[PDB]
């Protein structure tokens, strides 16, 4: 008693961004690069258009 | 010296030459053929003369 007081109000917000973020899945690939600079020799043929 | 790049006959035939040997068979053929008139960088519609 005997005192007033003055009141300012505030607010905060608590939010998860990251839980949604993840890495889904990772994949890779196997390739045969045609550079020239080769002989055939092993095997033959095989895949034929 | 035309440096004919050869294929064996029909497609699918195990014979051929090479994509490797074609290399420089292809390229010299250019060079040889081209460097005649093309004489390095640019071919000359006025022709190439080599002193």
**Under 8 Å between Cβ of B5 and B22:** yes
CA distances from B29 to A4, A38, B15, B23, B40 (A): 101, 19, 22, 10, 13
Classify residue B25 as exposed, middle or buried by CB count within 10 Å of its CB (0-12, 13-18, 19+).
middle
Resolution given for this structure, in angstroms: 6.8
B19–chain A Cβ distance below 8 A for any pair: yes
Q: How many CB pairs under 8 A join A and B?
A: 19
The experimental technique behind this entry is cryo-EM
Are A38 and B12 within 8 A, CB to CB? no
Classify residue B35 as exposed, middle or buried by CB count within 10 Å of its CB (0-12, 13-18, 19+).
middle
By C-alpha distance, the chain B residue nearest A40 is B18
How far apart are the C-alpha atoms of B18 and B7, rounded to whole Å?
9
- Nearest Cβ partner for B19 among A36, A44, A45: A36
CA distances from A41 to A4, A9, B14, B15 (A): 97, 82, 10, 11
């Amino acid at each position: 008693v005997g005192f007033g007081f003055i009141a300012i109000t505030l607010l905060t917000m608590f939010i998860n961004v990251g839980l949604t973020l993840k890495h889904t899945e990772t994949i890779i690939n196997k390739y045969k690069n045609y550079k020239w600079d080769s002989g055939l020799p092993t095997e033959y043929a095989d895949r034929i258009a | 010296m035309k440096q004919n790049i050869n294929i064996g006959n029909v497609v699918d035939d195990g014979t051929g030459d090479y994509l490797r040997k074609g290399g420089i068979k292809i390229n010299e053929n250019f060079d040889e053929l081209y460097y005649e008139l093309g004489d390095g960088d640019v071919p000359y519609s006025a022709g190439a003369w080599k002193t």
